[PDB]
């Protein structure tokens, strides 16, 4: 067979230990899920420094804790705007997930609080910026470099899925690089607790699984499809399915055809054909052996999963970092006021925050 006795025993033991870890992690998650933390700091504990990001998602600001000098990334949502855009449940659920999970590649929520006008999530500052920027700048990642990142996503999805959390928002724009060169996953507005199926059309065109496009009930296998898109884009510099208009992208996704650059290794192409599998009865991550079909694939043969988890692998790339407040890996945005009204807004809607 493919493994001798020693290798098979070692692999089996490793897989059993993962089960044991995940069972403990689920116990810890559910305690925090059932009794969320609230109101652990206030706004005047922090100096506002610079806007790190802004969009439909609100704003994210670099802030500095006045007494420790620690920098943080503070997500600010306008309560009235969240209600207008019909995002109450997503906003509450994002914060509830973030205060309950614990994993080395999931961003840490250090404080949260609210005031008359806004909701605030104070997260670790991840200074290396988006993977997106580095990928477009370098062009493409070599396969070992791509694999280093991919391994962290595999472990993070293995963790999230064991909690019955589907992620649904994977793309390089939503992965940050920390000071050690490791990945941080930050955005949980599309994440949902799903033991079985769910039906919402959400995501980004290039990363949508075919069953989402086709308006099916779907499951956590959409995240393994998206991993395939991510690995392809990291290794090629462009995603597998693209076109001028989303409808043309969707036609390609559902077609069952995917084409590869000539520099892709055969191992990589085999992994990607099994992740980018339209047929759900054949897609890696959705079969009887679950995540192990991915972790045991030839393309990951050199991956020491425990060493990645322990963050003991030397990263391929360390972003430039000139001090704890450095924002050079982020873009510049127009700086807008943080207005706090004398009157409380939408109090009932956000009692749980």
């Amino acid at each position: 067979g493919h493994m001798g006795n020693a290798a098979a025993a070692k692999k089996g033991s490793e897989q059993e230990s993962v089960k044991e870890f995940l069972a403990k992690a689920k116990e810890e998650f559910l305690k925090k899920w059932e009794s969320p933390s609230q109101n652990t700091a206030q706004l005047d504990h922090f100096d506002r420094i610079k806007t790190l990001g802004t969009g439909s998602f609100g704003r994210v600001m670099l802030v500095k804790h006045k007494e420790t000098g620690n920098h943080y990334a503070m997500k600010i949502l306008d309560k009235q705007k969240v209600v207008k855009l019909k995002q109450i449940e997503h906003t509450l659920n994002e914060k509830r997930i973030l205060q309950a999970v614990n994993f080395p590649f999931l961003v840490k929520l250090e404080f949260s609080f609210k005031d008359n006008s806004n909701l605030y999530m104070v997260m670790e500052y991840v200074p290396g910026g988006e993977m997106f920027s580095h990928l477009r700048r370098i062009g493409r990642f070599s396969e070992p470099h791509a694999r280093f990142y991919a391994a962290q996503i595999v472990l993070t999805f293995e963790y999230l899925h064991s909690l019955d959390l589907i992620y649904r928002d994977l793309k390089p724009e939503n992965l940050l690089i920390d000071q050690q060169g490791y990945i941080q996953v930050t955005d949980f507005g599309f994440a949902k607790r799903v033991k079985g199926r769910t039906w919402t059309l959400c995501g980004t065109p290039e990363y949508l699984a075919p069953e989402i496009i086709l308006s099916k009930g779907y499951n956590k296998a959409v995240d393994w499809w998206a991993l395939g898109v991510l690995i392809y884009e990291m290794a090629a510099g462009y995603p597998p399915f693209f076109a001028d208009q989303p409808i043309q992208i969707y036609e390609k996704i559902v077609s069952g055809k995917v084409r590869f650059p000539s520099h892709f290794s055969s191992d990589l192409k085999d992994l990607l054909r099994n992740l980018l599998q339209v047929d759900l009865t054949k897609r890696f991550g959705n079969l009887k052996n679950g995540v192990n079909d991915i972790k045991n694939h030839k393309w990951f043969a050199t991956t020491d999963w425990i060493a990645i988890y322990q963050r003991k692998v030397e990263a391929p790339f360390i972003p430039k970092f000139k001090g704890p407040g450095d924002t050079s890996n982020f873009d510049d945005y127009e700086e807008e006021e943080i207005r706090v009204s004398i009157n409380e807004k939408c109090g009932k809607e956000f009692t749980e925050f």
């Binding site: 439909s56 997106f132 477009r136 928002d169 793309k171 724009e173 599309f190 059309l201 959400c202 995501g203 980004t204 065109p205 290039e206 949508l208 090629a236 510099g237 462009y238 693209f242 076109a243 001028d244 989303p246 084409r259 650059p261």
Partner: peptide, 18 residues
């Protein structure tokens, strides 16, 4: 080339959710 096709798509920048 596929890279040229990628540039032609106009979707080389940050992509919004649907």
């Amino acid at each position: 080339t596929x890279y040229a096709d990628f540039i032609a798509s106009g979707r080389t920048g940050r992509r919004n959710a649907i």
